mmCIF file of N, CA and C in Angstrom:
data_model
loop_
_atom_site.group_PDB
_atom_site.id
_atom_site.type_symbol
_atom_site.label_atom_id
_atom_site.label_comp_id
_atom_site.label_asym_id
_atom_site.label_seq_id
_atom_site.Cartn_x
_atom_site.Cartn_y
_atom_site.Cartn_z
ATOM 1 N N UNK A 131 113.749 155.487 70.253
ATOM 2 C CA UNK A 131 112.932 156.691 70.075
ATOM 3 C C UNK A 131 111.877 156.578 68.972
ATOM 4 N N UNK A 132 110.388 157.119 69.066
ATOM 5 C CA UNK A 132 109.314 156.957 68.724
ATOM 6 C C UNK A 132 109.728 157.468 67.192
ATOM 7 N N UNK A 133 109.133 157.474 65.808
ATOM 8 C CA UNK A 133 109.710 158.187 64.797
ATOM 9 C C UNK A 133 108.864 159.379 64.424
ATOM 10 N N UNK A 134 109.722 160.729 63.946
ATOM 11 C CA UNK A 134 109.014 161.647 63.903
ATOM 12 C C UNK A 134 107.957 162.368 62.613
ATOM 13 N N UNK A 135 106.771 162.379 63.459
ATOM 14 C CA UNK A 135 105.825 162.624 62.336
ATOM 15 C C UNK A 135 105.942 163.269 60.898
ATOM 16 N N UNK A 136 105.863 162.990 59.958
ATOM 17 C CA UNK A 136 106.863 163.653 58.832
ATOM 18 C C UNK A 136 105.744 164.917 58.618
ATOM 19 N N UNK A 137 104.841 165.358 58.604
ATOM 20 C CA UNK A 137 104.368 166.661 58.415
ATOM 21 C C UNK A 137 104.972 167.446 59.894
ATOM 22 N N UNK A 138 105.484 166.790 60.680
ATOM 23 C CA UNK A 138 105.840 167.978 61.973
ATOM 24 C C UNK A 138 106.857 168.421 61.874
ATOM 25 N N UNK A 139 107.830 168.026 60.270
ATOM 26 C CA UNK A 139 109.130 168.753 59.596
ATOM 27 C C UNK A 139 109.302 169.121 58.806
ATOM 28 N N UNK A 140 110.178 169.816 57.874
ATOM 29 C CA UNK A 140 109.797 170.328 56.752
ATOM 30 C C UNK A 140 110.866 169.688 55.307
ATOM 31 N N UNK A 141 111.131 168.546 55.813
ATOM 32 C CA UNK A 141 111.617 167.900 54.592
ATOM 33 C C UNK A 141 110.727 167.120 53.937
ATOM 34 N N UNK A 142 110.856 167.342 52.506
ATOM 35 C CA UNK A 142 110.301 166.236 51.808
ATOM 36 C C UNK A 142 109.976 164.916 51.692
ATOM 37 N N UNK A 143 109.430 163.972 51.937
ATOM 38 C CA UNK A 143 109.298 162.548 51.132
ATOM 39 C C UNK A 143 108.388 161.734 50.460
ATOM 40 N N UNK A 144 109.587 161.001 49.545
ATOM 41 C CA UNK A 144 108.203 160.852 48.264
ATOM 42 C C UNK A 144 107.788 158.821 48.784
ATOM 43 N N UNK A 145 108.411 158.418 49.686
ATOM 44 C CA UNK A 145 107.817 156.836 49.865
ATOM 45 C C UNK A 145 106.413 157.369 51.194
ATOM 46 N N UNK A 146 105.522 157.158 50.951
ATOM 47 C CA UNK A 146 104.775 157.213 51.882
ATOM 48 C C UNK A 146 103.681 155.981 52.167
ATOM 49 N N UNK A 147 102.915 155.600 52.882
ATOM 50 C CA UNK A 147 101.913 154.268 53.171
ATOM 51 C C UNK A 147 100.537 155.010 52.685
ATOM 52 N N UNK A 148 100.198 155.137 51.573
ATOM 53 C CA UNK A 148 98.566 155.428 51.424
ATOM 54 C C UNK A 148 97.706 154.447 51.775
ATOM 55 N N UNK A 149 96.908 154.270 52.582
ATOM 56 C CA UNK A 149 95.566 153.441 53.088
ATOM 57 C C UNK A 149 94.764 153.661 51.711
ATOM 58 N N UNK A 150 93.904 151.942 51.288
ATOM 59 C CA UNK A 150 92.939 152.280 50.244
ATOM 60 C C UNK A 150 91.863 151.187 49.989
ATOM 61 N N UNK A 151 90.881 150.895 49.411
ATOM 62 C CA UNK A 151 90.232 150.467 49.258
ATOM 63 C C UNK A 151 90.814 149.392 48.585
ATOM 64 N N UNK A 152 90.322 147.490 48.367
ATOM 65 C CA UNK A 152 90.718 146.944 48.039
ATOM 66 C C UNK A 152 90.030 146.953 46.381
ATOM 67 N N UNK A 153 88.815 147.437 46.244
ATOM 68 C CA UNK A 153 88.376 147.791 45.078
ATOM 69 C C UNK A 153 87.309 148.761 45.362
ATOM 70 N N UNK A 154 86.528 148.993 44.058
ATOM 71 C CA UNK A 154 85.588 150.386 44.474
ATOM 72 C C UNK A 154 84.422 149.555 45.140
ATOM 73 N N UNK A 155 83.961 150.947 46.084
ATOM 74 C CA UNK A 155 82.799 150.476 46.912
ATOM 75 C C UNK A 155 81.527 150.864 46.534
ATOM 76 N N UNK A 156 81.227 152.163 45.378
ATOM 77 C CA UNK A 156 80.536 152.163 44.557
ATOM 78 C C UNK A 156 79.511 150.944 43.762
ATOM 79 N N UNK A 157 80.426 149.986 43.726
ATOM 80 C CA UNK A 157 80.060 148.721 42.963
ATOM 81 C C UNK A 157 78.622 148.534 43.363
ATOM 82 N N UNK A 158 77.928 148.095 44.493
ATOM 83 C CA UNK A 158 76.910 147.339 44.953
ATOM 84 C C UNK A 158 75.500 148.300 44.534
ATOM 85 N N UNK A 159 74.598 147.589 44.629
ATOM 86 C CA UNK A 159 73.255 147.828 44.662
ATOM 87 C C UNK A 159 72.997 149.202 45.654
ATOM 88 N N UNK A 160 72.271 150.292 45.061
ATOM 89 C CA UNK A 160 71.476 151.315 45.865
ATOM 90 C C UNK A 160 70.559 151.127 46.690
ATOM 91 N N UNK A 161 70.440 150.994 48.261
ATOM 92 C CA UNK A 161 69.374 151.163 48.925
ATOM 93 C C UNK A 161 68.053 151.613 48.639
ATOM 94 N N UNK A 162 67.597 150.808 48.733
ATOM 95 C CA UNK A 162 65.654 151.548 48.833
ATOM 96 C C UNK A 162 64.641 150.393 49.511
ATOM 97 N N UNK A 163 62.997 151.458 49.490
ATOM 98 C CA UNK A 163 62.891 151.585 50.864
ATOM 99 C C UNK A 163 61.335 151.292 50.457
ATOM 100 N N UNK A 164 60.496 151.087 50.898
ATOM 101 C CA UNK A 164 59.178 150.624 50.361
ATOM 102 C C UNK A 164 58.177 151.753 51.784
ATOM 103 N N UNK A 165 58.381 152.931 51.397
ATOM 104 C CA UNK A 165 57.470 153.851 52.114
ATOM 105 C C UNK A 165 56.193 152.828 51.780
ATOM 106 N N UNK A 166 55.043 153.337 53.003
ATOM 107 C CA UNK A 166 53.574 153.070 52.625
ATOM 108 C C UNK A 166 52.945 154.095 53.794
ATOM 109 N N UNK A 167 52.842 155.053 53.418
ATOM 110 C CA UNK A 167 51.534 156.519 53.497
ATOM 111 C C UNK A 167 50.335 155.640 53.939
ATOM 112 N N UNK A 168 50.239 156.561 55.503
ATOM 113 C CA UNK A 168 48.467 155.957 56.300
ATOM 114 C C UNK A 168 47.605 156.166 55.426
ATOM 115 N N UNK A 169 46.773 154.869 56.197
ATOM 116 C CA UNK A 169 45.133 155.096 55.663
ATOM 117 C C UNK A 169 44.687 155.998 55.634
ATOM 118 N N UNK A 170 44.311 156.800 56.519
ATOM 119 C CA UNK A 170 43.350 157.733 56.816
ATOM 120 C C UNK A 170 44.187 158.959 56.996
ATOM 121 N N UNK A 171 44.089 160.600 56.283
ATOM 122 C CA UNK A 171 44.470 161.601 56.740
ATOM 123 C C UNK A 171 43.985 161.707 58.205
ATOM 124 N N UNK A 172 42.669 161.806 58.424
ATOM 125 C CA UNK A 172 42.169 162.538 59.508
ATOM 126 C C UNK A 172 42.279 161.566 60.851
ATOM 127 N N UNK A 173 42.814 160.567 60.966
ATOM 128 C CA UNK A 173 43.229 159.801 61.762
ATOM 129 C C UNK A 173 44.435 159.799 62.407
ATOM 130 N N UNK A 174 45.447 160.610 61.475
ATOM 131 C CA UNK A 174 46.471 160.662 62.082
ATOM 132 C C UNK A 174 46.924 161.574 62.925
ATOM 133 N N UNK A 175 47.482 161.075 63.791
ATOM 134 C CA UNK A 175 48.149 161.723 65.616
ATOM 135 C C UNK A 175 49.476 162.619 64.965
ATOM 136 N N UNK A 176 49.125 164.049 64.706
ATOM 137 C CA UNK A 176 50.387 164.554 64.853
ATOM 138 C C UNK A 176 50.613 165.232 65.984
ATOM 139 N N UNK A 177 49.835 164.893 67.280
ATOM 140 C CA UNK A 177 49.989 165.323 68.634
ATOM 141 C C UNK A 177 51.237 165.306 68.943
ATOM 142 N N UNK A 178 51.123 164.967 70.475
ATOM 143 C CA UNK A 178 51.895 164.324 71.302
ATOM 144 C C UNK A 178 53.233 165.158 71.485
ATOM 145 N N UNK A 179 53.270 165.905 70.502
ATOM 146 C CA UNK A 179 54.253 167.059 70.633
ATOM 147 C C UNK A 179 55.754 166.674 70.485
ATOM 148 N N UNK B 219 52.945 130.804 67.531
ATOM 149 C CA UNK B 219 52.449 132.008 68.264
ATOM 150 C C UNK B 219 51.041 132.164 67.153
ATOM 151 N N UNK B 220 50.238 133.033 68.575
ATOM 152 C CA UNK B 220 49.175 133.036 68.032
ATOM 153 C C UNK B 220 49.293 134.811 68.342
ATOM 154 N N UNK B 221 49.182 134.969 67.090
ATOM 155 C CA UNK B 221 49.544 136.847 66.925
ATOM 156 C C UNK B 221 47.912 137.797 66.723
ATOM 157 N N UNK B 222 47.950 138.059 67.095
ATOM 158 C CA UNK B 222 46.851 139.305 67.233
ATOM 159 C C UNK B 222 47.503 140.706 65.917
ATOM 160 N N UNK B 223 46.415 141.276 65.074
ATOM 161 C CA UNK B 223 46.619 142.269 64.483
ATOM 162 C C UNK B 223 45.493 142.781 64.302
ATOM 163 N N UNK B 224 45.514 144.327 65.100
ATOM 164 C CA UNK B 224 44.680 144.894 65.547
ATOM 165 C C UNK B 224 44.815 145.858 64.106
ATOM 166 N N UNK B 225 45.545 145.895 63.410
ATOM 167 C CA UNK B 225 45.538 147.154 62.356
ATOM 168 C C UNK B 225 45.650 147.169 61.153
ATOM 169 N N UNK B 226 47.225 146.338 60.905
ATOM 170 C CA UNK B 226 47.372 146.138 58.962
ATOM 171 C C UNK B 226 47.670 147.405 58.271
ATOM 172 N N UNK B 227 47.764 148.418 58.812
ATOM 173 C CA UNK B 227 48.038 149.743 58.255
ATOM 174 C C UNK B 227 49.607 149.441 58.221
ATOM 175 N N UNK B 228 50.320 149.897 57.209
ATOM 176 C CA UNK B 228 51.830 150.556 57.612
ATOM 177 C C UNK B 228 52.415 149.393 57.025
ATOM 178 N N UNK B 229 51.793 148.407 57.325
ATOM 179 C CA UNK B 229 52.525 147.001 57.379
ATOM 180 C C UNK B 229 52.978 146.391 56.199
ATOM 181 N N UNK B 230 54.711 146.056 55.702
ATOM 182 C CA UNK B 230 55.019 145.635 54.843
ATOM 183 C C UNK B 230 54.660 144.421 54.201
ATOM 184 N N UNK B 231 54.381 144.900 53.037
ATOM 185 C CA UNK B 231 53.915 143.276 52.228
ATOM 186 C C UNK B 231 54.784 142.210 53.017
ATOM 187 N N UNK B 232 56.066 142.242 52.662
ATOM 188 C CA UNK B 232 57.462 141.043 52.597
ATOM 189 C C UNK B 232 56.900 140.719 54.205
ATOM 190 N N UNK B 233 56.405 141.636 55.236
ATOM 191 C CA UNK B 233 55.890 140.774 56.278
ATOM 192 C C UNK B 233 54.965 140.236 56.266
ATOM 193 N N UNK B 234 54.145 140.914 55.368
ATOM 194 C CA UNK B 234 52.522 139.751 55.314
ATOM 195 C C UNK B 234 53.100 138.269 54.870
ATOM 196 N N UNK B 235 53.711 138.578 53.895
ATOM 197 C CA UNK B 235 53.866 136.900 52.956
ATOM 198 C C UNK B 235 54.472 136.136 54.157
ATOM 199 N N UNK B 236 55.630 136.564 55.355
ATOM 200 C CA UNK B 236 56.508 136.165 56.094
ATOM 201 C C UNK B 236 55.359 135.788 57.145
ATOM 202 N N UNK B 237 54.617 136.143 57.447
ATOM 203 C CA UNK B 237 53.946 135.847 58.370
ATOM 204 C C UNK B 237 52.462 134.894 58.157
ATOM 205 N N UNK B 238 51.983 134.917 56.649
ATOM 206 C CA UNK B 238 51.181 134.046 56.309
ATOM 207 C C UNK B 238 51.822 132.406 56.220
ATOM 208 N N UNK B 239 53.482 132.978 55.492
ATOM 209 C CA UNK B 239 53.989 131.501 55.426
ATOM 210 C C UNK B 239 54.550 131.170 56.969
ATOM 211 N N UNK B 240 54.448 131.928 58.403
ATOM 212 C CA UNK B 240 54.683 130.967 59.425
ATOM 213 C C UNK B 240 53.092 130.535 59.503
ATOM 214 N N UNK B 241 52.118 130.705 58.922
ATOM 215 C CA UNK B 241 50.855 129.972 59.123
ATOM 216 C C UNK B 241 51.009 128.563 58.904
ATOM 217 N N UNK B 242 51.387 128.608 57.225
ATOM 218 C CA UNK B 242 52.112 127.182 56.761
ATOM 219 C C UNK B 242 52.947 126.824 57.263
ATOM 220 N N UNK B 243 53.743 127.223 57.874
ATOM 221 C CA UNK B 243 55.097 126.328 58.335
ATOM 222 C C UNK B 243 55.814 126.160 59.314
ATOM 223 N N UNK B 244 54.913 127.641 60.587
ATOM 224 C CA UNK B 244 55.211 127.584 61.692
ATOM 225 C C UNK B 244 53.921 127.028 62.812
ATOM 226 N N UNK B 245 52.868 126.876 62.018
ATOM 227 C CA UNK B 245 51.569 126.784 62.483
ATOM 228 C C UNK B 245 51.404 127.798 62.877
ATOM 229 N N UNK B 246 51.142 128.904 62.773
ATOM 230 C CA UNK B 246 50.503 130.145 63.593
ATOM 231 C C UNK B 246 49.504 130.755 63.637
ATOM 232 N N UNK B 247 49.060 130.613 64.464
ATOM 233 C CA UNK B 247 47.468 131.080 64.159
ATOM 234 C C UNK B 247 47.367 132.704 64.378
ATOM 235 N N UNK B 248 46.601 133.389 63.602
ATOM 236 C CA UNK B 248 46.855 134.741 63.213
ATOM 237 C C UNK B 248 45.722 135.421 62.559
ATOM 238 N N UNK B 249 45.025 136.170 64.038
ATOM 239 C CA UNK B 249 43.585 136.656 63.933
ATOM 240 C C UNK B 249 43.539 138.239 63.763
ATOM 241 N N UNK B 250 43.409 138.755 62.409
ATOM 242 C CA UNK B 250 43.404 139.598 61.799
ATOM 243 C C UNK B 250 41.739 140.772 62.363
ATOM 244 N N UNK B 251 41.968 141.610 63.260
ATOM 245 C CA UNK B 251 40.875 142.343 63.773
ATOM 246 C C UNK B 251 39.680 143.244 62.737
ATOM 247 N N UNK B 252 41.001 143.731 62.209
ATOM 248 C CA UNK B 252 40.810 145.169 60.967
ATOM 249 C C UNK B 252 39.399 144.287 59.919
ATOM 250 N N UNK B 253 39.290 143.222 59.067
ATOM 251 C CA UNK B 253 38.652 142.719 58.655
ATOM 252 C C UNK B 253 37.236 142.750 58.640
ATOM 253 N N UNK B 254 36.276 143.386 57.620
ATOM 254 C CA UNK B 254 34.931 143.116 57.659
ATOM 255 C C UNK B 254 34.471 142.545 56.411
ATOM 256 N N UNK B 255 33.081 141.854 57.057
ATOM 257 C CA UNK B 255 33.084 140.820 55.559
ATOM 258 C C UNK B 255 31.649 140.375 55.640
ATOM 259 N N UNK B 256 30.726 140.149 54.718
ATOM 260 C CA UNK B 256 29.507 139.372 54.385
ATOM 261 C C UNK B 256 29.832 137.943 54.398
ATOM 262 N N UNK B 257 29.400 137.179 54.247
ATOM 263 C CA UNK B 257 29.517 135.726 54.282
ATOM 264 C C UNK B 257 28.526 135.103 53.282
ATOM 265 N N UNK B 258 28.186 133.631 53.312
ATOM 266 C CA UNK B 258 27.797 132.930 52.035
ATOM 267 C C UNK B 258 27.753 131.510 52.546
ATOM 268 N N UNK B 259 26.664 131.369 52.859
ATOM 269 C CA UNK B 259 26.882 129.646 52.798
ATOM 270 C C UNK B 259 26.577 128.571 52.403
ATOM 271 N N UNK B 260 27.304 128.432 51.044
ATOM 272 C CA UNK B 260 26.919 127.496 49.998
ATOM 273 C C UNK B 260 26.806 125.837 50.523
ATOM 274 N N UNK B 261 25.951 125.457 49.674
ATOM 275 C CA UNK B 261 25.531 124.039 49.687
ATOM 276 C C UNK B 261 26.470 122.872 49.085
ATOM 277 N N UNK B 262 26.797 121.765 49.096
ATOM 278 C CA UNK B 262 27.940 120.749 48.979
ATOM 279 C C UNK B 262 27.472 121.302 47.515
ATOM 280 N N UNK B 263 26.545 121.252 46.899
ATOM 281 C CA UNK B 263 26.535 120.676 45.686
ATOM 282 C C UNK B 263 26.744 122.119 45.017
ATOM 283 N N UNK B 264 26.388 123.407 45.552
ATOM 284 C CA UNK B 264 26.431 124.532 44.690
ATOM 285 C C UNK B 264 28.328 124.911 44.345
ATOM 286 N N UNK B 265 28.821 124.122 45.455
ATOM 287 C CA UNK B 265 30.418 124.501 45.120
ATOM 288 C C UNK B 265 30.474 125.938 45.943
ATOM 289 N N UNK B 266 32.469 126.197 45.994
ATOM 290 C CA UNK B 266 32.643 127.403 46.116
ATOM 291 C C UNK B 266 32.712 128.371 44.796
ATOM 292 N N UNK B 267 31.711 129.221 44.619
ATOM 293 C CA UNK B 267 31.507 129.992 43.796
ATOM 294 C C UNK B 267 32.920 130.630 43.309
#
């Protein structure tokens, strides 16, 4: 028999499996992005809908 | 490849350099449209100015 989900009872337990990161993922470099704004205002197509 | 660029707007530096150095190293020939220019045509002896 399959074992039963322990929040679908109302006993306590304190051994449980927490899932976790092997270290922080914070660590690395911030993304960024090298925008470059058209030439020309009056050239640009904000048509097309 | 011989690439056609009809524009140069928008276009990231890191691709210009990437694409000047397949000039050097991929042979590519790469005819830039957008471009206007006077010219000059110096003599052996006057040098390039």
């Amino acid at each position: 028999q399959v074992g039963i989900p322990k929040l679908e009872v109302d006993h306590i337990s304190f051994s449980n499996v927490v899932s976790m990161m092997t270290a922080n993922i914070r660590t690395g470099d911030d993304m960024a992005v090298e925008r470059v704004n058209p030439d020309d205002v009056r050239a640009i197509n904000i048509r097309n809908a | 490849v011989h690439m056609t660029i009809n524009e140069r707007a928008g276009m990231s530096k890191l691709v210009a350099d990437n694409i000047i150095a397949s000039v050097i190293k991929s042979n590519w020939v790469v005819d830039i449209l957008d471009i206007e220019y006077t010219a000059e045509v110096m003599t052996p002896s006057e040098g390039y100015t």
